[PDB]
């Protein structure tokens, strides 16, 4: 039961399912102590069963319990666990993540196979903790707390902070993903090359594996944090180390379109 922005209250459906149950249990105790006839106690008892039933699995047997003046079935414990929106397939086998971003992709012919264009403004957020430590080590700010205050306002950002970020990302890779991730090459690792501008630059040769065009596709970026994650990305996931299809064994990163045409 939480107060949202406006001072309004927002509450989970389980609270209402419990309340129905509690009312009926309490009324049943009262009807028993007062010696109600069997018709009344029976009606109360069967209603109690239905209230337990809605709490655990609503809609399973009988009419789904709804809040008044809405047709929406209340979301019971079973609904929470199961389905596409359920606990398993939404928060457990997949999650939203920190140190990630997304933008529109643009072709980068000048890139080497292991590189990508990464907007500097995206890179400042994704690597923000790394950038703060480095801003203290050289000295752009007295300490970590002050450094964060400087990035908050965009006009307080001086030009030495961009050089600091270049130092941070040295030798590190980022992960690029384009949905749908149909096979494992929907994710590949790249060494980011910071660029002015708001677009991610993708190497032409990897467009096939990602099924990417430039008709407006977007890609997501992820930062592997640990030395272990960074090693995995650079060795196993690097674009240049995966040149052949895991399916057919044929070359995946290969000439196409203009490249074929010129040759």
């Amino acid at each position: 039961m939480v107060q949202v922005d406006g001072g309004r209250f927002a509450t989970s459906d389980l609270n209402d399912l419990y309340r129905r149950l509690i009312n009926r249990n309490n009324r049943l105790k009262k009807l028993l102590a007062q010696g109600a006839p069997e018709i009344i106690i029976r009606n109360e008892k069967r209603m109690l069963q239905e209230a337990v039933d809605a709490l655990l699995d609503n809609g399973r047997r009988g009419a789904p319990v709804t809040n008044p003046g809405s047709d929406r079935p209340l979301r019971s414990l079973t609904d929470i666990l199961s389905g596409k929106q359920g606990r398993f397939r939404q928060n457990l086998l997949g999650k939203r993540v920190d140190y990630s971003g997304r933008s529109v992709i643009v072709v980068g012919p000048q890139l080497k196979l292991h590189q990508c264009g990464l907007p500097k403004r995206m890179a400042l957020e994704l690597f923000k903790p790394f950038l703060l430590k480095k801003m203290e080590e050289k000295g752009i700010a007295p300490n970590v707390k002050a450094a964060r205050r400087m990035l908050e306002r965009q006009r307080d950002i001086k030009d030495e902070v961009w050089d600091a970020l270049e130092e941070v990302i040295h030798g590190k890779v980022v992960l690029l993903n384009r949905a749908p991730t149909l096979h494992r090459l929907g994710i590949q690792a790249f060494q980011p090359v910071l660029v002015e501008g708001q677009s991610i630059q993708l190497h032409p040769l990897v467009c096939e594996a990602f099924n990417a065009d430039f008709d407006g596709d977007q890609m997501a970026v992820h930062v592997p944090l640990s030395s272990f994650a960074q090693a995995e990305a650079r060795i196993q996931m690097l674009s240049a180390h995966n040149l052949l299809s895991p399916a057919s064994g044929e070359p995946l990163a290969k000439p196409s379109r203009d490249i074929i045409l010129g040759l």
Binding site: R46, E50, G62
Partner: peptide, 8 residues
């Protein structure tokens, strides 16, 4: 099968 109807 219908709780109102049963009680009625």
């Amino acid at each position: 099968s219908d709780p109102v109807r049963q009680y009625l």
